[PDB]
Amino acid sequence: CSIDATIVAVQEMRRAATGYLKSNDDKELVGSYFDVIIRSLNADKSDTPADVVRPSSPDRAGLVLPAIYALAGQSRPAFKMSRTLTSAEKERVVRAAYRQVFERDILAYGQSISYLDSKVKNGEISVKEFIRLLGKSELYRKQFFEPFINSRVLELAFKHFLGRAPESRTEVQNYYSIVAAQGLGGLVDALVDGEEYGRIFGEDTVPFIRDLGQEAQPSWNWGAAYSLYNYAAPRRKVPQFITLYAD
Amino acid sequence: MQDAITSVINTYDVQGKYFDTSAFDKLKAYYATGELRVRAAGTISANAATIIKEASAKLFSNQPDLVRPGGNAYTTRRYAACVRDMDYFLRYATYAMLAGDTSILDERVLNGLKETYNSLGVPISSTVQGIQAMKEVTGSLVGSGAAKEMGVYFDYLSSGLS
């Protein structure tokens, strides 16, 4: 095809459609909706925008997502603590952290860790340290450690702190070694202090669920992963990833 | 999710044709109710706590055994969880009303609801009654014209559970 011919054609349709409108605001609006076509064609003078790559360990596959696939408006809003924010959006970030770690806002019950909240708001601890101290607390231990065997604890902790499902037998194997040896604190420390967490979320960004449209999605854990990214996930007690990767 | 506009656009995009008369009729119908639905959504957003209060009062007056020992709502924690579930149902009904579509209810409420309530032992019939009670309270609060629109999505939730 000829890109110049396409640009001329789109300009011609812009002029024609502007002709029928007979109203300045309508003309400028449709002109903008055609200028987006012209601008995108002109912007792709070099190659198309680079595909977003999700890196991985030697146990799980490395994947790419076309940049076109991500920017359909479905990307989750990152909740970041800037230490200069005012109180309202500071509370907003704290509530996002609670929703992520405990799958829901536990202010519905009046449950919170007040000193941890104060420390994260005022900057003594970061959002990463807040997430770690929040997953190591008595509340998390009561909600997501006691009712579960260590394998299910492993999987739900992946969901709560990494924003994703386990992708490998080696992954569940290593994190079961860690949990079985060191308990909940060791498991949460291993998840938060890993390279992937700092890669994706960092010090100041609350974790989020990295489901379809956020990153490239693995194919091999699809059904189990999307069972896990569901509020009915704690209602299941049998582990679903060690069993799957053994199957 | 979807809304009414996205559903119409996808319906006419998968075929590959421009909007026909039926498309414009559906869009006009959706746009005509828009201001009434926005007014209702604002009234509910400002007054969700009240609607939950009278709806829960009506439910627990109709079925006292829920809040007495041996009832699924007998504990401060389980009472709080009950009213929290009522707030979910109200908020997602409002979202669906504004969207004009039930896609958000299938995606974000009904997916995993039966498993949750069957695992926890929550009575589904009593939850349907609570949703109905929120239906009457919301209809009384936002007016009949918006009451019908919101009752559509409340009935969707109720039939989704039962």
Binding site: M13, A17, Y20, L29 | F24
Partner: peptide, 27 residues
């Protein structure tokens, strides 16, 4: 409503616009 009126105007006249662009660039 205004945007729907604009859309009606363009969908009624769609064939003319496409044919005009094609004529401008083709043959």
């Amino acid at each position: 409503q205004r945007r729907l009126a604009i859309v009606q105007i363009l969908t009624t006249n769609a064939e003319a616009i496409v044919s005009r662009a094609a004529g401008r660039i083709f043959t």
